[PDB]
Amino acid sequence: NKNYYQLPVVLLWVEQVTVPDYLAGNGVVYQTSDVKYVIANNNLWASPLDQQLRNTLVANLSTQLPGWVVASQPLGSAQDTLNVTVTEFNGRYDGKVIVSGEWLLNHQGQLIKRPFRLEGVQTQDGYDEMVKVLAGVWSQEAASIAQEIKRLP
């Protein structure tokens, strides 16, 4: 059978999330060696990964930022903007999942650029658990971004 996977979806405009080509295909990515990434043929994203990363980012930030309106749509001219590149979002042969990239926040004219690289541990086999753990780590990255925002005026 074919299986499809979704990162669960639980002023600030999350303008865009970019992924490179190898993460932009239909299949979920598994790193089988130190050099090789494989796109699954029968275990696919239920919608393109950059869209899922963007939507889950909006929802996770919304739960992390009470008093804020976080959206994937423009909200107002004075809004903060958040642009994210995700360069790694995959499982790995050693049971780990890797989530890394860089975000760029424009908060009232201040540009804040922060790299991120986080790891999770897959306690069960299968693409089910891999996607679960990746979603959890992505939510941790949203919490980190919201913590930086709450330290701003």
Author numbering: 22 to 31, 45 to 187
The authors write:
Consequently, we designed a second N-terminally truncated construct, in which residues 1–16 were replaced with a hexa-histidine tag and TEV protease recognition site, referred to as PqiC17-187, which was expressed cytoplasmically. After TEV cleavage of the N-terminal hexa-histidine tag, the sequence of PqiC17-187 differed from the native processed PqiC lipoprotein only by the removal of the N-terminally acylated Cysteine (C16). We therefore propose PqiC17-187 to purify as a monomeric species in contrast to the octameric oligomer of PqiC, implying multimerisation is dependent upon the N-terminal lipidated moiety. The PqiC17-187 structure, solved to 2.1 Å, displayed an arrangement unique to that observed in the PqiC structure with three copies present within the asymmetric unit. Two of these chains, chains A and B, sit in orientations similar to those of the two corresponding chains in the native PqiC asymmetric unit, however, the third chain, Chain C, sits perpendicular and slightly below the plane of the other two, interfacing with the bottom corner of chain A. Despite this global geometry change, the monomers from each structure align strongly yielding an RMSD of 0.568 Å across 151 pruned atom pairs and 0.591 Å across all 152 pairs. Whilst the density corresponding to the first residues of the β1-β2 loop region (residues 27–31) is more clearly resolved than in the full length PqiC structure, the electron density for the extremity of the loop (residues 32–44) was mostly absent from the 2mFo – DFc map contoured at 1 sigma preventing modelling of this region. Despite this, the electron density corresponding with the core of the protein was a considerable improvement over that of the full length PqiC structure with side chain information clearly defined in both β-sheet and α-helical regions. Overall, our PqiC17-187 structure provided us with high-resolution side chain information throughout PqiC, with the exception of the β1-β2 loop region, confirming the conformation of key residues of interest lining the octameric pore. Consequently, PqiC17-187 monomers are able to adopt a conformation more favourable for crystal packing thus, the molecules within the unit cell no longer assemble an octameric structure.
